[PDB]
Amino acid sequence: GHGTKGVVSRYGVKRLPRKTHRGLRKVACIGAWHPARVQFQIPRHGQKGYFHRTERNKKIYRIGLKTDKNSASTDADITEKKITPMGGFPHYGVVNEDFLLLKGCVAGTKKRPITLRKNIVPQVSRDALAQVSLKFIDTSSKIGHGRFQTSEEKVKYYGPLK
Amino acid sequence: GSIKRFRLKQRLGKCRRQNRPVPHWYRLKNTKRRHWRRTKLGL
Amino acid sequence: PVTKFITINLSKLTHKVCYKRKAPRAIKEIRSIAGKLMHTKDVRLDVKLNKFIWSKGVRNPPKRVRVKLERKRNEKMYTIVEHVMVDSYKGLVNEC
Amino acid sequence: SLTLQKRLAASVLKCGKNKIWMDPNEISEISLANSRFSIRKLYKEGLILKKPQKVHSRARVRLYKLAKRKGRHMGIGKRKGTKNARTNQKTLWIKRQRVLRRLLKRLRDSKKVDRHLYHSF
RNA sequence: UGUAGGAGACCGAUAGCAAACAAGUACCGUGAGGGAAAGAUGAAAUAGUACUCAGGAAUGAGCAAUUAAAUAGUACCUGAAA
RNA sequence: ACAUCUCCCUAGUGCAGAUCUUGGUGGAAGUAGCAACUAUUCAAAUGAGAACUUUGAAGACUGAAGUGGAGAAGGGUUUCUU
RNA sequence: AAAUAGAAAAAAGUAGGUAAGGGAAGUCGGCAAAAUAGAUCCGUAACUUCGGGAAAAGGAUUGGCUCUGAGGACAUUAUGUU
RNA sequence: ACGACUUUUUUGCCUCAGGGUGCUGUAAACAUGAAAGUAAACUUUACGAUCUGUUGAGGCUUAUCCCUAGUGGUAAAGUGU
């Protein structure tokens, strides 16, 4: 959700020239004397975000398990990692239980419920068929600029402190 | 302005004297009142 | 009646507001918090505490203040809000 | 309202209105005053005071002027004036001529040079 | 025209002299000048709204009270339409 | 104070309208709006009632081409106390 | 104290800022905005009525600190006071 | 924008505090420290931008950060059917 927004934000129209008397973000010209009504297809001010959306065909890269002590660890990097970042996720902290690692972007905010559904028809594509082999999963901080990866590593790096 | 002559002085004191409301002892047996900013003397 | 000693983070309460209204808002937030906590109609804010809030001018109020809240019934219910001088804010507790 | 008292008080004190202090206690007694003789009495007692002034210190300037005397801030980035505006051309000329002419007269008059040598020099 | 009379098949308060009145006034224009709005309680106020209660005070109400009449209460006749 | 159809003279005699004249009044509407000039806060007093009265404490601004002193024009008791 | 206050903080407006890589290719128009700008030291063309052009163009430098050097006035015959 | 929406109201929640994660960049203070020189003794004592040490220090880090049933809190008692 972003609130009720202007035409540029909501619909992506080009701004009016620098010259414009009543502002650059002033609307698209509706036009038509006949028909004698606004054409609904015109872009216009109102809500941005909070829309229902189906993302389709997102690949599962990994299903994590709470039971696994090495859940976000890999065969390549064997140090103890669970999916929870260094200092936890911003606004979410510890991931409590089992988890889905899904390719790319997902609609809505963190903290939101998300519904996963099987595809309407089975998928025979290369990308569908393919077996993922992960090499590494980051657990660096996203609270900061993620300069470090684990609490042990931070202790080893600094050493002495007050 | 600050400077004035006898006729102006007398008239201004006259206008001041005049302005005062009607006496209530007469009334029990009307008014024209001037407010300085709203109505100027026009002399 | 009771007298209790608490810490108000004003930086948190003044977070959204502009330089010009920052110290006024901080005063209002103190009054509102004390009022809410002691749940009183009348809240009285001491001059020493006021001087402390306004000390660094409009831009930069104290980020944390230790306030003394006194619930007092003499209806004649009110609370008085006063500052108690303190150095470090580390380890402070919200008891009587 | 202390209006009346503050106008009289300023004349009694011989000082600005903004520097007059009325005691917040016994304010009724102060407010009851209605003559300059009364206001004088209040000041004499100590219920109306002229404030101590805000008056700036020369201290910061004295340090800076001492530093200027030490030659420290006379560098290029502390110049905005022309060399003439910094030190005037006429003044320098006038100094050299007057000191030299005083010197020449004193040598001639004391008879350490002659009139001829003096006039040429 | 000024003053004094007598008049009327005239007008009856947006009419009629600009003026039924504290009007050639208020007010406006640098000034020459321009120039209004503006009558009605009742028979009698030497009948003008007493007194009480509730009201900070305005005011309201009264089992209280003038008048034949107060939804006649002095910006008071009747009191149309919007 | 009112009528006259019994008859007849007389008329400034019949309004929806003139972007009519004059006066009142709506819908528009609790809306447009109350947008120059850095900032006020705390406690008290007054009083029936205080963001904008008064006092005190803070914070600030005008910044000597001043929201400072004096004066002219012009205004004319605006002064000042109660 | 300004003909108001409070609370919220999105559009939109208005006075502002700031922007990767490009650099007028947008638009009638580099309009807007920005770049430039003070001093000292250098250096300065076409052209000219020889007066100018000219701050041309084009460069460099500039803080803080601790010093070094130069510039007066008085009175002892080379020395002092300041 | 405001309605509206998401919530929670004692196995919680808020509040601070602690701890985590960070962000900044080495605080004040003191040194019988050094430092271009300065002045005053015959190598010491006054003065000195500065730099180094104590010192990855000191600060800030929830408001729309994370964890903690750690502190203290947790009211009105109103209204429609």
What does the alpha-carbon distance between residue A93 and residue A86 come to, in Å, rounded to a whole number? 9
Number of helices (H) and strands (E) in chain A: give both, helices first: 3, 4
Q: Give the residue whose CA sits closest to G61 at C1'.
A: D76
Q: Centre a 10 Å sphere on the Cβ of residue A140 and count the other Cβ atoms it contains.
A: 16
What does the alpha-carbon distance between residue A58 and residue A41 come to, in Å, rounded to a whole number? 31
3-class secondary structure, C2: strand
Q: Amino acid letter at C89?
A: Y
Query: Rg of chain D over CA atoms, in angstroms?
Result: 32
Task: Tell if A7 CB is < 7 Å from nucleic strand G.
Answer: yes
Supply A6's token pair: 């202007």
CA of residue D3 to C1' of nucleotide F80, angstroms: 13
Tell me if A104 sits within 8 A of A58, measured CB to CB. Answer: yes
DSSP readout, chain D?
--HHHHHHHHHHHTS-GGGEEE-SSSHHHHHH--SHHHHHHHHHHTSEEEPPP----SHHHHHHHHHHHTTTT-SGGG--S-HHHHS-HHHHHHHHHHHHHHHHHHHHHTTSS-HHHHHH-
- How many residues can be counted in chain B? 43
* CB contact burial D97-118 (16+ within 10 A = b; e otherwise): eeeeeeeeeeebeeeebeeeee
Largest CA distance in chain D: 92
DSSP H/E element including A126:
helix A126-129
DSSP readout, C31-91?
HHHHHHHHT-S-EEE-HHHHHHHHTTTTT---SEEEEEEEEE-----EEEEEE---S--TT
Task: Tell if C28 CB is < 7 Å from nucleic strand G.
Answer: yes
B10: left (phi over 0), alpha (psi -120 to 50) or beta: alpha
The CA–CA distances, whole Å, from D75 to D78, D86, D89 equal 6, 12, 20
For A83, which DSSP code? S
The CA–CA distances, whole Å, from A158 to A87, A143, B7, C62 equal 17, 20, 99, 33
Give the protein-side footprint of strand F (Cβ within 7 Å): B 1-4, 8, 12, 15-16, 19, 34, 36, 40-41, 43; C 20, 23-24, 27-28, 31, 43-47, 50-51, 54-55, 57-58; D 1-4, 6-7, 20-22, 24, 27, 34
Cα-based angle D5, D6, D7 (whole degrees, multiple of 5)? 95
DSSP readout, chain B?
--S--HHHHHHHHHHHHHHSPPPHHHHT-------TTTS----
* A60 phi and psi angles, rounded to 5 deg: -75, 115
Say if residue C65 is exposed, middle or buried (CB neighbours under 10 Å; 0-12, 13-18, 19+). buried
Long-range contacts of A13-22 (CB under 8 A, 24+ apart): A13/A43
Q: Is A142 annotated as a binding residue?
A: yes
Of C5, C13, C23, the closest CA to residue C66 belongs to C5
What does the alpha-carbon distance between residue A47 and residue A2 come to, in Å, rounded to a whole number? 7
Tell me if D34 sits within 8 A of D4, measured CB to CB. Answer: yes
DSSP H/E element including A5:
strand A3-5
Give bridge partners of residue C64 from the DSSP assignment. Answer: C9
What does the alpha-carbon distance between residue D119 and residue D56 come to, in Å, rounded to a whole number? 56
Of C76, C73, C8, C60, the closest CA to residue C36 belongs to C8
Give bridge partners of residue D48 from the DSSP assignment. Answer: D22
The residues, ordered by sequence, that sit 6+ positions from C49 with a Cβ below 8 Å of its Cβ are: C30, C65, C67, C81, C82, C83
What does the alpha-carbon distance between residue C32 and residue C45 come to, in Å, rounded to a whole number? 11
Of A107, A75, A110, A72, the closest CA to residue A90 belongs to A110
What does the alpha-carbon distance between residue A1 and residue A43 come to, in Å, rounded to a whole number? 19
The residues, ordered by sequence, that sit 6+ positions from A95 with a Cβ below 8 Å of its Cβ are: A82, A83, A84, A89
What does the alpha-carbon distance between residue D62 and residue D66 come to, in Å, rounded to a whole number? 6
For A19, which DSSP code? T
For A52, which DSSP code? -
Strand H nucleotides with an atom less than 7 Å from a protein beta carbon: 1-2, 15-24, 56-58, 60-67, 71-75
Classify strands C43-45 and C78-83 as parallel, antiparallel or unpaired: parallel
- Angstrom resolution of this structure: 5.8
The CA–CA distances, whole Å, from A45 to A3, A4, A30, D98 equal 11, 7, 13, 85
Q: Amino acid letter at C71?
A: R
Task: Tell if B31 CB is < 7 Å from nucleic strand E.
Answer: yes
Q: Is A5 annotated as a binding residue?
A: no
Q: How was this entry determined?
A: cryo-EM
Question: Up-side HSE of residue A150: CA atoms within 13 Å toward CB?
Answer: 14
